[PDB]
Structures are given as C-alpha cells and as structure tokens.
Amino acid sequence: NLENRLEKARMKAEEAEHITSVYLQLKAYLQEESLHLGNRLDFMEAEVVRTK
C-alpha cells in the first residue's frame, strides 16, 4: 500500500514539474517583449503626429 501511494505521488509530481516548465517559457516570451512594448507605442505616437 505504501509503494502504491509513493509511485502515484511520484507520478503526480512530474506532471507538476512539466507545468512549471511550460509556464516559465510562457513568461520568457512575455518578458522580452515588454521591453519593445513601449518604444513601439512611442513610434506610433509619432505616427499620429506625422500624418497630422
């Protein structure tokens, strides 16, 4: 009985290991892009000026 609840939790741990890895990679795409997020708006702010 105790091995059966060890391997079941060993199974349950790894499917929580994966979800950490797919969320950190999802973070990394949002983080780098938040840097280019401002100057794109600044460029388009000047776009409203140039066609004014």
Partner: protein, 49 residues
C-alpha cells in the same frame, strides 16, 4: 521495518516537493497575469492609435 520507515520518509518528501512545486506554479500564474494585464493594456491603446 526500516523499509516501511524509510518508505514513509520517502513518500513525505515526494508529497512535500509536489506541494512546493504547486506553490511556485501558484507564485506564477498570478505573476503571469501580471504579465498579461499590461499585455491586455497596450493593445487597447495600440488599437486606439
């Protein structure tokens, strides 16, 4: 006897690591939303412009 004993200590560690894993997954998925809210904020002023 020691088998059962060592196996208790083992199961504990496994269920405890799973727990701290859910924790970091929960420290995230809140800060993931903290990277989605300004993500759901510029494109409303991008689509404005």
């Amino acid at each position: 006897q020691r088998r059962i004993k060592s196996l208790e200590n083992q199961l504990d560690k496994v269920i405890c690591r799973f727990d701290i894993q859910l924790a970091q997954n929960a420290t995230l998925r809140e800060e993931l939303d903290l990277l989605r809210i300004e993500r759901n904020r510029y494109l409303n002023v991008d689509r404005k412009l």
